[PDB]
Amino acid sequence: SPKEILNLTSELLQKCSSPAPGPGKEWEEYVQIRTLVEKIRKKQKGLSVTFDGKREDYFPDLMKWASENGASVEGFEMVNFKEEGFGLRATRDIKAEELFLWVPRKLLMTVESAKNSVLGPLYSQDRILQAMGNIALAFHLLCERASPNSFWQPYIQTLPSEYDTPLYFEEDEVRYLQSTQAIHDVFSQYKNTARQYAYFYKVIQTHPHANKLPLKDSFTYEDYRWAVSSVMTRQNQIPTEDGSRVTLALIPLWDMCNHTNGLITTGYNLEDDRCECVALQDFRAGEQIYIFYGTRSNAEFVIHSGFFFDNNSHDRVKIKLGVSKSDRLYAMKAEVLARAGIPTSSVFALHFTEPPISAQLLAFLRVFCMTEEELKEHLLGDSAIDRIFTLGNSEFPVSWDNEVKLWTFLEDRASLLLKTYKTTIEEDKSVLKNHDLSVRAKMAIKLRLGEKEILEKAVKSAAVNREYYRQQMEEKAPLPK
Amino acid sequence: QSGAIYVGNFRVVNRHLATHNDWANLVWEDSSRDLLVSSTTAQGCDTIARCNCQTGVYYCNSRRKHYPVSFSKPSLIYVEASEYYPARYQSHLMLAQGHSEPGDAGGILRCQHGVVGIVSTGGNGLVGFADVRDLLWLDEE
Ligand SMILES: [Zn+2]
């Protein structure tokens, strides 16, 4: 038990505990913390417990172990697909809605199970584990990994050694993401991971209740990083045993399926105390077994699941907007803000699918350029309740001048956002078609290209609607609404 | 899964499927929300979540299961006329994709911190949850 690692974690916690330094210097703070992370990583052995064989050699163990406990192991087989890695390949014809998967909870790994595990003494006193379910679940996975006589050890056997999450990025692969909004989320993720690792290694070394855990003998950055990455990439929500609350869970034999566009088809059957997944679509013989991971943007996909999906219709680019404190309509508009549920300032999303804008957006904008004379109509009158109800109705403009001003401001901000980026869309497409980059650089550059494409489409939509309203100005329509 | 929230000395359930006994013990109601609040003699075992999760789990009564779903923030959405409520303004309606057919109303959608709202509307592959976090008065006395 070397003492140098303790000082390294202490220094790391001290540095990362400070608030965000600001713009421009976030990069320098990132490289500083990455330097400390790298030095400690090469100061440790990495994976505390390593399986002698390869990942693909343990799948039959999963089949036998699950079959003994009533988890379906028929109708599919394990194959390493080149484009998404390991997955499930159907051994027969599966029709839509067909139920080919069910796993009893006994098999499932849950925060409650961790509370019933040897981690319970630590869970009792430490608040941090109490707050986030994923963190406690990750520590449960780590504790079970070092125990050869673990009921879930066959599950742990097949988990991949390394993933494609941002924590696996090198300085160049994060450099390719510079000037984009997602980099700030990468910053927050990496800083949180570092602070958690430092605090947790020091508590485990000092907390007496951790004496009996298998982690005390070896708690490296690689182990914690792998655990957090796995829980973050293959986690699903299930209710507590009593049914009072829901909690995070890792579902073996289900989360190993890849993602495709569609509708959620995974649900847990509390009455049977098991999780059942219905077929997302018709998977013929030899076709891959797909499921829907949720309605998350490609930015979240890259940050958490660890890959980028093409043709994703549910993508979005956070946009920071707000009303400056120097407008003469602040006091009168705050009444709507309070009554419209719209905060003073918050992060909004532009949607790739039509309509590009979102109700909460149409609302903030309608309140960002509207004139004063029209700012009391929604406050007084029998139509005030109807006006606030329809305040998000695109088909109901409050006024045509507010519309043209809104679309003007939208084009202005979108053009500013396009200018802000370091590179151009043409260069990105040429790099994708010409160069041969690694997978991680590949998804990073694809993410940047997708953000630029969504912004360009937003500019186009704003311009068409602005032209539409200008022609509507040349026209006469009696219905204001 | 009785189709209603039991907390404190109160009962929260959809207005359109409530019984006359609820109105006999009416303390507050709202037609625009399809939310009915009635007083209960017993003490409920459910806690109201005062957090802002946009992802939870809801019970699809038609399937006798519960599904995880990602829902939009509380906002006012047009609701098409049905056999029970004619099309009118409906506030505090969380909208998300899911299975919701007639009679599904009453399923509780649950996140980490507790109850957020209740399934109120369905159709066209869309599911509407009515918020209950706003009314802070709904707590122990
Ligand atoms: Zn919550």
Residue numbers in the entry:
A (entry chain B): 21 to 501
B (entry chain F): 6 to 146
Copied sentences from the primary study:
SETD3 is an essential host factor for the replication of a variety of enteroviruses that specifically interacts with viral protease 2A. SETD3 functions as an actin-specific histidine N-methyltransferase, and comprises an N-terminal SET domain and a C-terminal Rubisco large subunit methyltransferase (LSMT) like domain. The N- and C-terminal domains of SETD3 form a V-shaped central cleft, within which the actin substrate is recognized and methylated at residue H7318,19.
